[PDB]
Amino acid sequence: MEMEKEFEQIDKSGSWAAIYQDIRHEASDFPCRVAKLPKNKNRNRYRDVSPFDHSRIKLHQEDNDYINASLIKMEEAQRSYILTQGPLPNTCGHFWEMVWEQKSRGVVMLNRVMEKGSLKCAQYWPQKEEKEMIFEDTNLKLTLISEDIKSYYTVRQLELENLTTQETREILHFHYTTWPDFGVPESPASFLNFLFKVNESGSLSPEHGPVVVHCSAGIGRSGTYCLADTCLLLMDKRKDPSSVDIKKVLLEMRKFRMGLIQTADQLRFSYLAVIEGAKF
Ligand SMILES: [Cl-]
Ligand SMILES: [Cl-]
């Protein structure tokens, strides 16, 4: 296992911080003019995390098309992802409008709504069957149909209805609920099981739009999920599976959204998840 040997070499050298800073230095820089317009100030959760203009998702209704979300198109892996921030109280209607317009059928959430007493995301889906949500700005209704609550993740069956046309769609909400409050998981086992459950659900089917992935900023935990999923896809396809270079894959994803993988510990965990998932 070449990656397992390079991993052990990086560990033995204590050079995760060094590799991670090289990634930061080598990462693409593209404009984010739309994100920074005055009229979009209250659409961004974090002033330092913005979508590039070239890859941002545009909303189709007529007054303001902006959402803090990026299309990551991993051409060789043959999968696209939408990475987005945790919705704000005023952007939940936009979030579901994006889900509708992009034809997504899965949402991957990697945070709890509150962590360490701080809010990471608005409560953008209904917790009770009988208390559906109506987004009057985007004319959508969202109902909780059922959920399967497990020890380390929950999968919810939501019904999203376009109130204009009365069309309905089933959306699966894949909520990883156990990422630690600080740092990364000690073992990737639970995270891998979750990733495989998302894949097995039929959500990443090329018949549907891209999966929507978020955490609080849509770059750290979300970057780890995207990076691990993309590397596992490449290994399951490439003639030489050991030729998958995780640093190069990450730099490719960073052409589409800034800041993906926010710490050297996230980078090490991504390597560890890919190594362990490849064995599986
Ligand atoms: Cl403006
Ligand atoms: Cl960064």
mmCIF file of C-alpha atoms and ligand atoms in Angstrom:
data_model
loop_
_atom_site.group_PDB
_atom_site.id
_atom_site.type_symbol
_atom_site.label_atom_id
_atom_site.label_comp_id
_atom_site.label_asym_id
_atom_site.label_seq_id
_atom_site.Cartn_x
_atom_site.Cartn_y
_atom_site.Cartn_z
ATOM 1 C CA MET A 1 0.000 0.000 0.000
ATOM 2 C CA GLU A 2 1.919 2.994 -1.339
ATOM 3 C CA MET A 3 -0.340 5.592 0.273
ATOM 4 C CA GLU A 4 0.006 3.762 3.594
ATOM 5 C CA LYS A 5 3.803 3.981 3.260
ATOM 6 C CA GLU A 6 3.850 7.653 2.276
ATOM 7 C CA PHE A 7 1.360 8.288 5.101
ATOM 8 C CA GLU A 8 3.699 6.590 7.577
ATOM 9 C CA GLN A 9 6.596 8.576 6.090
ATOM 10 C CA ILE A 10 4.731 11.869 6.606
ATOM 11 C CA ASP A 11 3.818 10.839 10.153
ATOM 12 C CA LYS A 12 7.408 9.790 10.920
ATOM 13 C CA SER A 13 8.625 13.126 9.496
ATOM 14 C CA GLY A 14 5.977 15.199 11.299
ATOM 15 C CA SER A 15 5.446 17.142 8.078
ATOM 16 C CA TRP A 16 1.627 17.357 7.767
ATOM 17 C CA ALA A 17 1.752 21.077 8.560
ATOM 18 C CA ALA A 18 4.401 21.540 5.860
ATOM 19 C CA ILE A 19 2.437 19.661 3.165
ATOM 20 C CA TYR A 20 -0.734 21.522 4.172
ATOM 21 C CA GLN A 21 0.949 24.939 3.942
ATOM 22 C CA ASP A 22 2.272 24.020 0.484
ATOM 23 C CA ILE A 23 -1.313 23.308 -0.586
ATOM 24 C CA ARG A 24 -2.420 26.652 0.769
ATOM 25 C CA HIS A 25 0.375 28.400 -1.143
ATOM 26 C CA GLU A 26 -0.265 26.550 -4.406
ATOM 27 C CA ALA A 27 -4.076 26.915 -4.327
ATOM 28 C CA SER A 28 -5.929 28.788 -7.068
ATOM 29 C CA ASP A 29 -7.026 32.388 -6.612
ATOM 30 C CA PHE A 30 -10.025 33.513 -8.671
ATOM 31 C CA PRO A 31 -12.329 36.495 -8.238
ATOM 32 C CA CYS A 32 -15.350 36.493 -5.935
ATOM 33 C CA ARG A 33 -16.827 39.782 -7.084
ATOM 34 C CA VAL A 34 -20.481 38.813 -6.772
ATOM 35 C CA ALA A 35 -20.061 37.411 -3.256
ATOM 36 C CA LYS A 36 -18.483 40.685 -2.186
ATOM 37 C CA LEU A 37 -21.152 43.017 -3.591
ATOM 38 C CA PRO A 38 -22.800 45.154 -0.876
ATOM 39 C CA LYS A 39 -26.220 43.649 -1.547
ATOM 40 C CA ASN A 40 -24.897 40.150 -0.696
ATOM 41 C CA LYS A 41 -23.423 40.992 2.707
ATOM 42 C CA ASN A 42 -26.140 39.213 4.647
ATOM 43 C CA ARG A 43 -26.007 36.132 2.390
ATOM 44 C CA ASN A 44 -22.545 35.132 3.601
ATOM 45 C CA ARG A 45 -22.084 33.474 6.977
ATOM 46 C CA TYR A 46 -18.326 34.248 7.040
ATOM 47 C CA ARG A 47 -16.763 37.288 5.361
ATOM 48 C CA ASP A 48 -13.589 35.251 4.627
ATOM 49 C CA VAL A 49 -15.361 32.343 2.826
ATOM 50 C CA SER A 50 -16.835 33.168 -0.569
ATOM 51 C CA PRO A 51 -17.607 31.256 -3.781
ATOM 52 C CA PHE A 52 -15.585 32.102 -6.896
ATOM 53 C CA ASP A 53 -17.598 33.812 -9.600
ATOM 54 C CA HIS A 54 -16.798 31.134 -12.188
ATOM 55 C CA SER A 55 -18.163 28.207 -10.151
ATOM 56 C CA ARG A 56 -20.885 29.793 -7.991
ATOM 57 C CA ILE A 57 -24.399 28.413 -8.144
ATOM 58 C CA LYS A 58 -26.839 30.962 -9.518
ATOM 59 C CA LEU A 59 -30.471 31.045 -8.307
ATOM 60 C CA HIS A 60 -33.020 31.328 -11.122
ATOM 61 C CA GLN A 61 -35.587 33.658 -9.567
ATOM 62 C CA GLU A 62 -35.342 37.349 -10.960
ATOM 63 C CA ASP A 63 -34.178 39.754 -8.231
ATOM 64 C CA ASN A 64 -30.883 38.452 -6.667
ATOM 65 C CA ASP A 65 -29.279 35.252 -7.950
ATOM 66 C CA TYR A 66 -26.688 34.892 -5.186
ATOM 67 C CA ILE A 67 -26.115 31.985 -2.818
ATOM 68 C CA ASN A 68 -22.833 31.071 -1.096
ATOM 69 C CA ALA A 69 -22.447 27.723 -2.894
ATOM 70 C CA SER A 70 -19.996 26.357 -5.442
ATOM 71 C CA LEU A 71 -20.206 23.612 -8.068
ATOM 72 C CA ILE A 72 -17.172 21.354 -7.779
ATOM 73 C CA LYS A 73 -17.005 19.440 -11.002
ATOM 74 C CA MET A 74 -14.515 16.587 -10.624
ATOM 75 C CA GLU A 75 -14.256 15.610 -14.279
ATOM 76 C CA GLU A 76 -11.953 12.587 -14.001
ATOM 77 C CA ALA A 77 -13.835 11.167 -11.021
ATOM 78 C CA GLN A 78 -17.102 11.762 -12.909
ATOM 79 C CA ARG A 79 -18.899 13.315 -9.981
ATOM 80 C CA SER A 80 -20.035 16.827 -9.187
ATOM 81 C CA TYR A 81 -20.790 18.241 -5.729
ATOM 82 C CA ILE A 82 -22.339 21.493 -4.558
ATOM 83 C CA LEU A 83 -20.459 22.721 -1.463
ATOM 84 C CA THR A 84 -22.276 25.401 0.484
ATOM 85 C CA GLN A 85 -22.246 27.136 3.856
ATOM 86 C CA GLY A 86 -24.754 26.201 6.552
ATOM 87 C CA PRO A 87 -27.871 28.181 5.642
ATOM 88 C CA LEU A 88 -28.580 31.392 7.525
ATOM 89 C CA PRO A 89 -32.013 32.318 8.907
ATOM 90 C CA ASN A 90 -32.620 34.483 5.779
ATOM 91 C CA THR A 91 -31.147 32.013 3.220
ATOM 92 C CA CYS A 92 -33.064 28.809 3.942
ATOM 93 C CA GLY A 93 -35.522 29.586 1.144
ATOM 94 C CA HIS A 94 -32.542 30.156 -1.204
ATOM 95 C CA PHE A 95 -30.973 26.884 -0.086
ATOM 96 C CA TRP A 96 -34.052 24.862 -0.980
ATOM 97 C CA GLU A 97 -34.541 26.819 -4.199
ATOM 98 C CA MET A 98 -30.990 25.730 -5.134
ATOM 99 C CA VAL A 99 -31.808 22.115 -4.258
ATOM 100 C CA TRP A 100 -34.908 22.291 -6.477
ATOM 101 C CA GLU A 101 -33.307 24.077 -9.420
ATOM 102 C CA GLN A 102 -30.159 21.910 -9.400
ATOM 103 C CA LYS A 103 -32.232 18.714 -9.151
ATOM 104 C CA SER A 104 -30.340 17.420 -6.177
ATOM 105 C CA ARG A 105 -31.829 14.517 -4.296
ATOM 106 C CA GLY A 106 -29.372 14.279 -1.375
ATOM 107 C CA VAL A 107 -28.106 16.803 1.183
ATOM 108 C CA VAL A 108 -25.080 15.879 3.317
ATOM 109 C CA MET A 109 -24.791 17.786 6.577
ATOM 110 C CA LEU A 110 -21.568 17.375 8.581
ATOM 111 C CA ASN A 111 -22.233 19.481 11.682
ATOM 112 C CA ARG A 112 -24.711 19.656 14.452
ATOM 113 C CA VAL A 113 -26.823 22.835 14.383
ATOM 114 C CA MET A 114 -25.141 23.922 17.642
ATOM 115 C CA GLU A 115 -21.660 22.782 18.683
ATOM 116 C CA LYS A 116 -19.936 23.925 21.883
ATOM 117 C CA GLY A 117 -22.837 26.304 22.490
ATOM 118 C CA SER A 118 -22.348 28.128 19.183
ATOM 119 C CA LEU A 119 -24.720 28.055 16.210
ATOM 120 C CA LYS A 120 -23.212 26.605 13.069
ATOM 121 C CA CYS A 121 -26.358 26.591 10.827
ATOM 122 C CA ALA A 122 -30.022 27.548 10.836
ATOM 123 C CA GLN A 123 -32.675 24.926 11.541
ATOM 124 C CA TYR A 124 -33.455 24.655 7.811
ATOM 125 C CA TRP A 125 -35.508 21.436 7.832
ATOM 126 C CA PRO A 126 -38.574 20.470 9.915
ATOM 127 C CA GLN A 127 -38.024 18.394 13.023
ATOM 128 C CA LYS A 128 -41.717 17.381 13.361
ATOM 129 C CA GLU A 129 -43.966 15.821 10.704
ATOM 130 C CA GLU A 130 -46.932 18.072 11.603
ATOM 131 C CA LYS A 131 -44.904 21.305 11.525
ATOM 132 C CA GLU A 132 -43.880 21.643 7.884
ATOM 133 C CA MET A 133 -41.841 24.622 6.692
ATOM 134 C CA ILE A 134 -43.007 27.081 4.067
ATOM 135 C CA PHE A 135 -40.425 29.332 2.406
ATOM 136 C CA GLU A 136 -42.600 32.170 1.194
ATOM 137 C CA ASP A 137 -39.814 33.983 -0.676
ATOM 138 C CA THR A 138 -39.065 30.985 -2.936
ATOM 139 C CA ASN A 139 -42.517 29.345 -2.814
ATOM 140 C CA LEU A 140 -41.447 25.979 -1.463
ATOM 141 C CA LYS A 141 -42.864 23.668 1.179
ATOM 142 C CA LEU A 142 -40.768 21.114 3.062
ATOM 143 C CA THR A 143 -42.237 18.284 5.153
ATOM 144 C CA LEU A 144 -40.557 15.670 7.292
ATOM 145 C CA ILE A 145 -41.913 12.299 6.149
ATOM 146 C CA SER A 146 -39.780 9.964 8.341
ATOM 147 C CA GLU A 147 -36.299 9.615 9.723
ATOM 148 C CA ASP A 148 -33.912 6.775 10.555
ATOM 149 C CA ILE A 149 -31.910 7.919 13.551
ATOM 150 C CA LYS A 150 -28.747 5.846 14.081
ATOM 151 C CA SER A 151 -25.966 6.154 16.624
ATOM 152 C CA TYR A 152 -23.534 8.119 14.431
ATOM 153 C CA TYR A 153 -25.737 9.590 11.652
ATOM 154 C CA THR A 154 -29.399 10.124 10.822
ATOM 155 C CA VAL A 155 -31.090 9.835 7.427
ATOM 156 C CA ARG A 156 -34.291 11.837 6.948
ATOM 157 C CA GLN A 157 -36.863 11.445 4.209
ATOM 158 C CA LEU A 158 -38.069 14.922 3.296
ATOM 159 C CA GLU A 159 -40.720 15.945 0.799
ATOM 160 C CA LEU A 160 -39.919 19.190 -1.030
ATOM 161 C CA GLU A 161 -42.862 20.676 -2.918
ATOM 162 C CA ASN A 162 -42.707 23.457 -5.459
ATOM 163 C CA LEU A 163 -45.808 25.363 -4.413
ATOM 164 C CA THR A 164 -46.080 27.066 -7.830
ATOM 165 C CA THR A 165 -46.353 23.815 -9.816
ATOM 166 C CA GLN A 166 -47.373 21.392 -7.020
ATOM 167 C CA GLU A 167 -44.628 18.996 -8.073
ATOM 168 C CA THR A 168 -43.051 17.124 -5.208
ATOM 169 C CA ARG A 169 -39.675 15.391 -4.778
ATOM 170 C CA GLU A 170 -38.193 13.149 -2.131
ATOM 171 C CA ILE A 171 -34.916 14.541 -0.727
ATOM 172 C CA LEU A 172 -32.709 12.435 1.519
ATOM 173 C CA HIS A 173 -30.983 14.325 4.337
ATOM 174 C CA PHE A 174 -27.791 12.502 5.373
ATOM 175 C CA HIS A 175 -26.786 14.038 8.649
ATOM 176 C CA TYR A 176 -23.453 12.948 10.177
ATOM 177 C CA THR A 177 -24.067 13.856 13.763
ATOM 178 C CA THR A 178 -20.894 12.762 15.567
ATOM 179 C CA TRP A 179 -17.949 14.767 14.240
ATOM 180 C CA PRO A 180 -15.953 15.721 17.385
ATOM 181 C CA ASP A 181 -16.284 19.195 18.863
ATOM 182 C CA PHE A 182 -12.553 19.726 18.384
ATOM 183 C CA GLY A 183 -10.174 18.150 15.934
ATOM 184 C CA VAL A 184 -10.973 15.207 13.671
ATOM 185 C CA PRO A 185 -12.267 11.710 14.429
ATOM 186 C CA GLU A 186 -9.641 9.410 15.886
ATOM 187 C CA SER A 187 -10.747 6.685 13.456
ATOM 188 C CA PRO A 188 -12.369 7.141 10.042
ATOM 189 C CA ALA A 189 -14.609 4.096 10.470
ATOM 190 C CA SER A 190 -17.893 5.895 11.218
ATOM 191 C CA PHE A 191 -17.186 8.605 8.598
ATOM 192 C CA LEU A 192 -16.528 5.931 5.966
ATOM 193 C CA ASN A 193 -19.665 4.028 6.850
ATOM 194 C CA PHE A 194 -21.625 7.275 6.427
ATOM 195 C CA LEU A 195 -19.923 8.054 3.101
ATOM 196 C CA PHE A 196 -20.790 4.548 1.832
ATOM 197 C CA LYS A 197 -24.399 4.904 2.979
ATOM 198 C CA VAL A 198 -24.741 8.168 0.993
ATOM 199 C CA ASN A 199 -23.311 6.422 -2.062
ATOM 200 C CA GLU A 200 -25.556 3.367 -1.706
ATOM 201 C CA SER A 201 -28.729 5.458 -1.352
ATOM 202 C CA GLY A 202 -28.988 6.363 -4.994
ATOM 203 C CA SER A 203 -28.253 10.054 -4.284
ATOM 204 C CA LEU A 204 -25.039 10.364 -6.257
ATOM 205 C CA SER A 205 -26.767 8.738 -9.276
ATOM 206 C CA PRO A 206 -25.845 10.671 -12.453
ATOM 207 C CA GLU A 207 -29.578 10.739 -13.190
ATOM 208 C CA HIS A 208 -29.933 13.340 -10.387
ATOM 209 C CA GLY A 209 -28.304 16.705 -9.818
ATOM 210 C CA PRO A 210 -25.202 17.053 -7.640
ATOM 211 C CA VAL A 211 -25.315 16.167 -3.993
ATOM 212 C CA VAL A 212 -25.351 19.254 -1.768
ATOM 213 C CA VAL A 213 -22.718 19.117 1.010
ATOM 214 C CA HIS A 214 -22.395 21.540 3.889
ATOM 215 C CA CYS A 215 -20.940 22.177 7.271
ATOM 216 C CA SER A 216 -20.801 25.632 8.765
ATOM 217 C CA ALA A 217 -18.558 27.390 6.166
ATOM 218 C CA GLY A 218 -18.764 24.671 3.521
ATOM 219 C CA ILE A 219 -14.970 24.231 3.246
ATOM 220 C CA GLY A 220 -13.494 22.168 6.171
ATOM 221 C CA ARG A 221 -15.510 19.084 7.051
ATOM 222 C CA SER A 222 -17.241 19.474 3.684
ATOM 223 C CA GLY A 223 -13.848 19.508 1.966
ATOM 224 C CA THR A 224 -12.870 16.315 3.821
ATOM 225 C CA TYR A 225 -16.037 14.579 2.654
ATOM 226 C CA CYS A 226 -15.591 15.693 -0.958
ATOM 227 C CA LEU A 227 -11.874 14.869 -1.039
ATOM 228 C CA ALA A 228 -12.338 11.384 0.419
ATOM 229 C CA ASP A 229 -15.316 10.578 -1.783
ATOM 230 C CA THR A 230 -13.542 11.792 -4.937
ATOM 231 C CA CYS A 231 -10.332 9.854 -4.172
ATOM 232 C CA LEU A 232 -12.254 6.649 -3.523
ATOM 233 C CA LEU A 233 -14.081 7.088 -6.858
ATOM 234 C CA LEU A 234 -10.759 7.608 -8.669
ATOM 235 C CA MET A 235 -9.215 4.535 -7.104
ATOM 236 C CA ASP A 236 -12.207 2.409 -8.050
ATOM 237 C CA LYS A 237 -11.710 3.551 -11.676
ATOM 238 C CA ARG A 238 -8.026 4.231 -12.418
ATOM 239 C CA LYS A 239 -5.916 1.485 -13.958
ATOM 240 C CA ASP A 240 -3.273 2.184 -11.279
ATOM 241 C CA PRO A 241 -5.262 2.883 -8.071
ATOM 242 C CA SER A 242 -2.065 3.752 -6.172
ATOM 243 C CA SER A 243 -1.466 6.611 -8.636
ATOM 244 C CA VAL A 244 -4.181 8.672 -6.914
ATOM 245 C CA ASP A 245 -2.349 11.653 -5.447
ATOM 246 C CA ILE A 246 -4.510 13.167 -2.734
ATOM 247 C CA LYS A 247 -2.681 16.520 -2.749
ATOM 248 C CA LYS A 248 -3.269 16.904 -6.473
ATOM 249 C CA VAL A 249 -6.947 15.973 -6.106
ATOM 250 C CA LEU A 250 -7.328 18.595 -3.379
ATOM 251 C CA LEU A 251 -5.658 21.269 -5.511
ATOM 252 C CA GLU A 252 -8.056 20.368 -8.345
ATOM 253 C CA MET A 253 -11.063 20.819 -6.033
ATOM 254 C CA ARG A 254 -9.652 24.125 -4.852
ATOM 255 C CA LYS A 255 -10.020 25.470 -8.399
ATOM 256 C CA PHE A 256 -13.760 25.454 -7.658
ATOM 257 C CA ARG A 257 -14.025 26.624 -4.031
ATOM 258 C CA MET A 258 -11.470 28.280 -1.766
ATOM 259 C CA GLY A 259 -10.131 26.895 1.462
ATOM 260 C CA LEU A 260 -11.162 23.264 1.133
ATOM 261 C CA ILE A 261 -9.539 21.418 4.081
ATOM 262 C CA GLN A 262 -8.952 23.994 6.774
ATOM 263 C CA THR A 263 -6.288 22.245 8.930
ATOM 264 C CA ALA A 264 -3.402 19.828 8.661
ATOM 265 C CA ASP A 265 -5.367 17.494 10.911
ATOM 266 C CA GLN A 266 -8.213 17.465 8.327
ATOM 267 C CA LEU A 267 -5.635 16.728 5.661
ATOM 268 C CA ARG A 268 -4.188 13.813 7.657
ATOM 269 C CA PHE A 269 -7.668 12.511 8.385
ATOM 270 C CA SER A 270 -8.547 12.650 4.694
ATOM 271 C CA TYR A 271 -5.490 10.531 3.895
ATOM 272 C CA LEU A 272 -6.439 8.110 6.620
ATOM 273 C CA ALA A 273 -10.040 7.806 5.387
ATOM 274 C CA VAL A 274 -8.949 7.145 1.819
ATOM 275 C CA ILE A 275 -6.390 4.502 2.948
ATOM 276 C CA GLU A 276 -8.936 2.744 5.100
ATOM 277 C CA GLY A 277 -11.744 3.073 2.588
ATOM 278 C CA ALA A 278 -9.599 1.672 -0.227
ATOM 279 C CA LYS A 279 -8.999 -1.473 1.840
ATOM 280 C CA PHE A 280 -12.767 -1.831 2.328
HETATM 281 CL CL CL B 1 -24.582 45.829 -4.635
HETATM 282 CL CL CL B 2 -6.833 27.723 3.110
#
